[PDB]
Design a protein around this ligand. Sequence first.
Ligand code: WPY
Length: 165
Amino acid sequence: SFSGYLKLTDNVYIKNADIVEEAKKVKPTVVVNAANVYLKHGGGVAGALNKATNNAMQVESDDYIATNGPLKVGGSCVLSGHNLAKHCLHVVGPNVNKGEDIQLLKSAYENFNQHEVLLAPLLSAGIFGADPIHSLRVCVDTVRTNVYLAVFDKNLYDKLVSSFL
Ligand SMILES: CC(=O)Nc1nccs1
């Protein structure tokens, strides 16, 4: 199972780790992707997860979008986890760099409550432009299921742990 995580609350855990390396190691039931509404996995966590699947995640995503249309900001879809997990929960957090409503971050984290345990990144953090300290706060105040957060950046991980209320 998950190892080396620091417990933040009854159900939220955090580790300074590469989510791709963490997923390849643990092979969780659910890995969360920091997706956009188009499921175009170009950069950040999405680009890294997609590259680990040898682009199979993008091929599957394009078929999903061709059939269903784009997701909503704050929404999600369950697709295959390929070589990383049983499933990938593609969750769309608001992209602050696109002027998307940050109040949608709580709606995005609510998607995690449909899964008993997840390996996940901080939603809307990184290239999505939101404050990662705010994202962690929304995570612990919204998610009731067991979430194992992988924070790639060591300096951000230390800042998140040392500032956690
Ligand atoms: C390679 C890479 O970006 N990994 C990440 N893990 C958690 C957040 S970003």
